[PDB]
Amino acid sequence: DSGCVVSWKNKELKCGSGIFITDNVHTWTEQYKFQPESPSKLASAIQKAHEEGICGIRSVTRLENLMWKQITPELNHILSENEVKLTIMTGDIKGIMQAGKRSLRPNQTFLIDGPETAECPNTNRAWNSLEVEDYGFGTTNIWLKLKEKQDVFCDSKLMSAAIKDNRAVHADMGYWIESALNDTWKIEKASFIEVKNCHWPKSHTLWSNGVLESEMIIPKNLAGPVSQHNYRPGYHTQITGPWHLGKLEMDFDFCDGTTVVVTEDCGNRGPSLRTTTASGKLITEWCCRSCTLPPLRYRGEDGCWYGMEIRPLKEKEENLVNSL
C-alpha cells in the first residue's frame, strides 16, 4: 500500500508505502459487499444440508446476511430448475448474530437468519461455512466460497490490526476497537454495526499473552479480541452488555444528564440497565462499587446504557429496562 495521509491530531502529513488499516465501520457508503463465486455450488450444498436434517443457517457477519438477501431469488430459481421442492427464505438480523452447530460442506422450508424459532433451532442451523476467495475493485467486491473446515473463528481475511503512536486498533468489517496509553494501556472506544458469535483469531491480535477472559471488556464469545488492550481497570467481562442492540457505540464517559459515584453502598454488578425507563423518565443518580471513572457507557438506537457494575443509586431496578 502506497500513498499519503494527513493526521489532524498529530498535525502532520505523511507519504510512503506500508499498511493502511481503514475504519470500515464509520464509512458513509457500503464500501464492501459479499458475493459468491458460484451460487450453484451454494445451492448444491444447501440441498445436501437440508437432506441431512439442517433446516436453516445463521450468518456470522451482517454482510453475509445482506448477501443472502441479494442472492435468495437466484438460489430459489436454481433450486426450482434442479427439480427439488425446497423454498429458501432469509430474514433480518436480531441483535447478536447467534451461532449454529451445523455447517454446509464443499411443503418444505429453509429459514436463513430471521428471529428465533423452535421449529428450526440453532442446533440444526449451519454457521460459519464461508471464507473469502479474492477481491473486486472500484465499492469493492468480496468473493466467498465454502469453507473446507468448520471452526468457531471469524474469517481472518476480513480482520485487521494496527498500533502506532501508542494508539492501538483492532478492526473488522463490523468492529472498530481503539485502545490507548494514558498512564496505562486500556480500551477507550468501540464501535459495532454487528455483534457476532465467533472467536477473534489470535493471529490478528496485539498483546495476546497472559490474558484473562474474565478481564476482557468485550467478551471472547462475542468476537472480543483476547488482548490486554481489551482491559479497563475496575471493569470485568461485559457478558450481559446491551449486545442485543446489534449496532452500538461503547466508550468511557457519562450518559447525558446522569452522574455516577463510587461507593460501597452501591449494588453489585448485574445486567446492563438503560438510563431511560420504559415510560421515558430519566434515572439521574447512579453508582458503582469498585469501578473506575469515567463510566463505561454504550449508546444505541434507543438510548444510553451503562456497564454491568453501574447500578441506580436510589431508584429501584424493577422500573428500569435491562438487557436480558
Epitope: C255, D256, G257, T258, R274, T275, T276, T277, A278, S279, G280, K281, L282, E301, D302, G303, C304, V321, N322
Partner: antibody
Framework: EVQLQQSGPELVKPGASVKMSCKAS????????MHWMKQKPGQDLEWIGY????????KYSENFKGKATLTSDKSSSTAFMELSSLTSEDSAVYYC?????????????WGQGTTLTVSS | NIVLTQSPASLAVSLGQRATISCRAS??????????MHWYQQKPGQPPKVLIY???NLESGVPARFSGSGSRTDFTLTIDPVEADDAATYYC?????????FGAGTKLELKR
Amino acid sequence: EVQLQQSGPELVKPGASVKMSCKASGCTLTNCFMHWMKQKPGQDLEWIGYINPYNDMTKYSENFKGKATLTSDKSSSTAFMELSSLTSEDSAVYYCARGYLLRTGCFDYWGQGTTLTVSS
Amino acid sequence: NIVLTQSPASLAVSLGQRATISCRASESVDSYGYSFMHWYQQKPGQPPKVLIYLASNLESGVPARFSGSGSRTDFTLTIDPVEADDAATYYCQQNNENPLTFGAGTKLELKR
C-alpha cells in the same frame, strides 16, 4: 409540567415552504425529544420524526425524508420543522409532542397544534 | 411498518355501560418483557391525552374506570362505567419499532 408552545396558524401558497416552531419549557437534556405528527382533519396521524434541541439527534420517517426538515435552537430550546414543496395533501394540523427514543416512553405531553392551509 | 387496526371504527354506548375497543398489530409490539402499546383520548379541537401507558398501566391522574390489557398483537381498552365526559375519539399507538404508528381511531358516541 413540560409545557409546549407551537407557532401560529399558517396560510401558504402551493409549492412554497413553511417553517413552524415549538418551544419546550420544563425540559431536560436526556428526555425532550420533540416528535412531529401530521393529521388531516379527522384522519389517522402520521409520524414524521423527532429532534432533540440539546442533542441535535434527529430521526425522520421514510414518508417524510424529502418533505420535512428538522432543526433546533439550544438556547431557545426550540424545534423547527420545514415542509419543502407544499401541496394540497399537506394542508392539515401539525402537532408537536414530547416523546423519547425507540423503545422508550409514550407521548407524555402535547403542544396545541399548528394549522396549515395551502391555497392561493 | 407495524400497522395498528382499531375495532370498531365508531362505537355508540349508553351511560354507565361497558365500552371495549380493540387494537390489532401486524407485528409484535412486545420487547424487553413489556408491551410498547398506549391508549390516548382526544377531545375535539384538543391535543390527545394519555390514558394507558404500556399495555396495562393507568396514567397518573386518570380515572380508574379506564383499563388496558393484551399482549403481542392484540390489545383491548375498557371503559367501565363510561360517563358523559368520555365522548371523544380513542387511538392506540406503538413504539416498538420505527416508524411510530397509530391506529385509525375509534369515535365514541354516548347514548342517552
